[PDB]
Amino acid sequence: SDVLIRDIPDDVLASLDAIAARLGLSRTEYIRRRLAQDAQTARVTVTAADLRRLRGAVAGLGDPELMRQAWR
Amino acid sequence: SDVLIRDIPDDVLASLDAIAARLGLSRTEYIRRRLAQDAQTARVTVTAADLRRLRGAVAGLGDPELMRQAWR
Amino acid sequence: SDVLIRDIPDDVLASLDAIAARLGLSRTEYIRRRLAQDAQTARVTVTAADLRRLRGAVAGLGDPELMRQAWR
Amino acid sequence: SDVLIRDIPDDVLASLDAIAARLGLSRTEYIRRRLAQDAQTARVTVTAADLRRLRGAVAGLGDPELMRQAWR
Amino acid sequence: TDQRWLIDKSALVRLTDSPDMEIWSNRIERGLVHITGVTRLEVGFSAECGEIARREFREPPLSAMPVEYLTPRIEDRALEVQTLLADRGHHRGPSIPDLLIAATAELSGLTVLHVDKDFDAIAALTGQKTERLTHRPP
Amino acid sequence: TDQRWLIDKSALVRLTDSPDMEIWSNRIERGLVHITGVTRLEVGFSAECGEIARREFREPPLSAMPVEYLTPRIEDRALEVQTLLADRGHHRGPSIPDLLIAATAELSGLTVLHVDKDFDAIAALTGQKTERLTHR
Amino acid sequence: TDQRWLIDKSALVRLTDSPDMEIWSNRIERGLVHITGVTRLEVGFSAECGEIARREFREPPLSAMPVEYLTPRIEDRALEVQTLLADRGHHRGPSIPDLLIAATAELSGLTVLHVDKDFDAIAALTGQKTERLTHR
Amino acid sequence: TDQRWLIDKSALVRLTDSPDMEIWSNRIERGLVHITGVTRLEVGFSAECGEIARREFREPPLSAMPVEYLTPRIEDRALEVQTLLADRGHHRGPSIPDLLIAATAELSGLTVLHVDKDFDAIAALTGQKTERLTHRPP
Ligand SMILES: [Mg+2]
Ligand SMILES: [Mg+2]
């Protein structure tokens, strides 16, 4: 989908334009790639061990009796 | 000026939203700050002599009494 | 429909803002919810017989096992 | 100042109009008074004892040495 | 006075047996006693059938109680309080509804009205105002 | 695809045992599996201590699940659905959390992911989309 | 009147001893005296334990003071002012908190309320409004 | 790799004396080492005069470090961590800048790079990633 960013300072835009040209990219292609790269860097990994660890830590969620207490 | 960034994939948008939420910023305030950050970072060679020059200028960062004074 | 409320004193606005902030709502979402709350509250005589009727209908609120079941 | 509240449901508005008429008030006068009354109910009282209690609890804010440590 | 209350299920079901029944009827009539959406769900669960529930919600006392709905900050506060109580050795309690009612009252400036000692456990951490409904002496 | 899920406690604790574990892990990584504030309180209730609860919320998979909070419309819808169940003699089947998760999913555009037949009872009244986790 | 204040630690701890105590108490009740996030961290540092800190933040007067948070423009302005002081040989007078409180007030439209001459040094560079608390 | 760092004052002043100096120069050049606005104020405080500060900010390494500014949630987190450490017996520390740098790194997904044992005290509560800069062996 489309995202409108308002009130970006002209000095920020001029620097981004110069950065993008050095990479052979338009301003908007550079911004799209920069945000995609950020998202890849932020992405979490969910492993089988993570899921086992959770099950062990909250095994009581599969206990109707404890879940009884939990809701008064 | 306003910039419209078109066709951001859903998964990229989801990462942007998670980051913004974790920081207590709106989606658009986060993107504005991230674009400023990028634009304002120099692309520059960093040498051993640069690190030694910096240490001589900021040696007081290693003086615990001076740093306690900075925070009173 | 939209309602414009004119000439709200600064100190009233400050209280509205503090309340909204404490709840994590915007100023306008808070006011909308507060106006709904008022509009939806009955102005009605409340008798001893009304309280006794209610107790007979909701006696299970005093059964700890039933209430534990409600929350599983 | 003026505050615009958007998208108030017609059933909420009709109830508020009926409540206001019973009190001899217009809709907007009723809303203004309701919000002012809310603010009065929420208002905090600051006593001499509150201020003494704070001073005792954070006497260290008047200690340059401790405030030294605090800022590294 | 300026005081307003948030009524827990534990007090709602015991009003008729309090020596202060009539005082509480009058305060409910005056709009001073609020109720949560969660407590309304507990009322529905307790009712024997749907028509009995519909009746209670359209009649006094429940129709006279301003409804307090949750917000994201209240939900997060309930979780924070739960975790802080776990640091202090609480295990398998206070209940989820008790945490949600207490956090609603805390952030809204309401006194919790109850007959449940777990509100004391929460107030040991939050310092919030609570009131225990009076009982008939045995 | 536009499909997103809201995970119930009954599926959360059984993911480690699903033959579809890998596909669900990938969807969680991408933000496609949301969780309610009420379910987080259930996780905390079950944890043995505060240290373990804090750890669970900051590590995957919970750290990767966006939180869906209640609204007045959702709380009222849960109560409406409860009353319909009660007309049929079925309202002490589904719990208060089950009602709140189902109404959140219904009004926020998510598919409930579960291992709890009470969601089938609710869906027979609401017509909403639900999915049962495969598990061994 | 349109005047609002931002209270420094140096005034906060001396209010109990001001002949203007009553007027300041009334302004606090009305939301006219704001406080920074940094000053709240200073309050917490000074508290003897966690119980006492929690109490101070939930009781008056701190419960009645709206919080003014930092922004990039404020953090950069503090650094600019620090560098101007350093040109004159005066930058180890005002602390980092003093700079951050002054820049917050300057850019957010508040008068700094203090008992610390370092705010007079900053104001001689910025031209911003400051007020010294009367105290005995 | 995906790893990014937030450099504390304690590591900034010791880079030139680390056996890993050149590795860190290269990571700073690649934009992988961020710095806070608060740490920039500490750099200015330490500088002997304003022109020396202006020089450092316009030259490598500082000009190559992406700047991380505070947000209201970071400021509130620092206060929460301070209070939780007070529950566990910490008194007159960790410092205010240490709490602000750690909370920035925690909510931004950055590893704190430091030579300060108080980041271990914070990580005992938060579980966040930290890295101690290597020192030259005596
Ligand atoms: Mg069930
Ligand atoms: Mg000073």
User: What one-character-per-residue DSSP string does D14-61 give?
Assistant: HHHHHHHHHTT--HHHHHHHHHHHHHHHH-----HHHHHHHHHHTGGG
Q: What is the maximum span of chain H, computed from C-alpha positions, in angstroms? A: 44
Residue H79, token pair as written in the block: 């206060």
Helix, coil or strand: residue A45: coil
Q: E80-118 burial, b if ≥16 CB within 10 A, otherwise e?
A: ebbbbbbbeebeebbbbbbbbbbbbbbbbbbbbbbbbeb
CB count in 10 Å sphere of residue B7:
10
Known binder of ligand: residue H20? no
E strands, chain A, are 3-5
Length of chain G: 136
The neighbouring-strand residues paired with B4 are: A4
* G93 shares contact with chain H (CB less than 8 Å): no
Q: Which domains does chain H have, with CATH numbers?
A: 1-138 (3.40.50.1010)
Structure solved via? X-ray
Residue type present at position H111:
T
The torsion angles phi and psi of F111, rounded to 5 degrees, stand at -90, 125
G97 → chain B, closest CA residue: B71
Strand residues in chain G grouped as ranges (E): 5-7, 33-36, 67-68, 111-114, 130-132
Nominal resolution in Å? 1.5
> Which chains lie within 8 Å of chain A at 3 or more CB pairs, if any?
B, C, E, F, H
Nearest CA in chain F to E98: F41
Q: Ligand 1 centroid to F93 CA: how many Å?
A: 6
Question: CA end-to-end span of chain C, whole Å?
Answer: 41
How close is the Cα of H77 to the center of ligand 2, in Å? Answer: 25
- List H residues 39-68 in contact with D (Cβ-Cβ < 8 A): 42
To the nearest whole Å, the CA of F105 is away from the closest chain H CA by: 28
Residues 51-70 of D with CB under 8 A from H: 66, 69-70
Ramachandran quadrant class, D57 (left: phi over 0; alpha: psi -120 to 50; beta: rest):
alpha
Look at the block and give the residue holding tokens 């009660």. F86
Distance between Cα C53 and ligand 1 center (Å): 30
Query: Order of strands, edge to edge, in the sheet holding E111-114?
Result: E67-68, E33-36, E5-7, E111-114, E130-132
> Residues 6 or more apart from G58 whose CB is under 8 A from it?
E126, E127
CB contact under 8 A, A12 and B1: no
F87 among annotated binding-site residues: no
Asked if C33 has any chain F CB less than 8 Å from its own CB, the reply is yes
Contact (CB<8Å) C33/E107: no
Nearest-by-CA chain H residue for B60 = H46
- Residue G79 phi/psi, 5-degree rounding, is -65, -45
Any binding-site annotation on E2? no
Nearby residues of G46 by Cβ (< 8 Å), 6 or more positions away:
D57, D58, D59, D60, D61, D63, D66, D70
CATH match of D8-72 with 1.20.1250.40: no
Chain F residues with CB-CB distance to E84 below 8 A: 50
Among candidate residues D49, B30, H5, the one with its CA nearest the CA of residue G61: D49
Q: Give strand ranges (E) for chain E.
A: 5-7, 33-36, 67-68, 111-114, 130-132
- Cβ-Cβ contacts under 8 Å between A and B: the total is 89
C72: helix, coil or strand?
A: coil
Tokens of C26: 């915007």
By the CB criterion, residues less than 5 angstroms from ion ligand 2 are G 95, 98, 116, 118
- Using CA atoms of C22, C28, C29, C31 in order, give the dihedral in degrees to the nearest 10: 80
As a whole number of angstroms, the distance between CA E58 and CA A69 comes to 30
Report which of B55, B57, A40 is spatially closest to residue H25, judged by C-alpha positions.
Answer: B55
Residue D4 forms beta bridges with which residues?
Answer: C4
Sign of CA dihedral F41, F45, F47, F53: positive
Interchain CB contact of F55 with H (< 8 Å): yes
Cα separation, F60 vs F35, whole angstroms: 13
As a whole number of Å, the end-to-end CA separation of chain D is 44
The C-alpha atoms of residue F134 and residue F115 are separated, in whole angstroms, by 8
DSSP code at position H61: T
Q: What residues contact residue G34 under an 8 Å CB cut-off, 6+ apart?
A: G4, G5, G6, G7, G65, G66, G67, G68, G108, G110
**Which of F105, F135, F101 shows the shortest CA–CA distance to F118?**
F101
Structure tokens at H100: 């602000």
Task: Tell me if chain H has a CB within 8 Å of the CB of G4.
Answer: no
Terminal Cα distance for chain B, rounded: 41
- Å between A15 CA and nearest CA of chain B: 5
3-class SS at G70?
coil
Helix/strand/coil for B38: helix
Task: Report which bound ligand comes closest to the CA of F95.
Answer: 1
d(CA E62, CA E39): 11
Burial class (CB in 10 A: 0-12, 13-18, 19+), E134: middle
Chain D, nearest residue to G54 by Cα: D57
| Six token digits for residue H7 | 């450099």
Q: Tell me the ligand closest to G117's alpha carbon.
A: 2
The radius of gyration computed from the CA coordinates of chain A, to the nearest angstrom, equals 23
Characterize A56-67 residue by residue with b for buried, 16 or more Cβ atoms within 10 angstroms of its Cβ, and e for exposed. Answer: ebbebbbeeebb
Topology given in CATH for the domain delimited by B1-72: Arc Repressor Mutant (1.10.1220)
- Number of inter-chain CB pairs under 8 A, A vs F: 81
E strands present in chain H: 5-7, 33-36, 67-68, 111-114, 130-132
A3–B31: do the CB atoms touch at under 8 Å?
A: yes
Identify the bridge partners of residue H113 per DSSP, sorted by sequence position: H7, H131
Ligand nearest to the CA of residue G112, numbered in listed order = 2
Q: For residue H52, what are its two tokens?
A: 């020396």
Cα F116 to ligand 1 centroid, rounded to whole Å? 6
Token pair 């309202």 is found at F91
A interface test, pick of E8, E46, E96 with most A CB neighbours within 10 Å: E96
Mutating which of G52, G56, G57, G58 best tests the E interface, going by the most E Cβ atoms within 10 A?
Answer: G58
State the amino acid at position G67 in one-letter form.
V
Instruction: State how far the Cα of H119 lies from the Cα of H128, in Å rounded to an integer.
Output: 9
For residue F54, the chain H residues in CB contact (below 8 A) are: 127
**How would you class A2 by CB atoms within 10 Å of its CB: exposed for 0-12, middle for 13-18, buried for 19 or more?**
exposed
Tokens of G37: 């996030």
Q: How far apart are the CA of F96 and the centre of ligand 1, in A?
A: 9
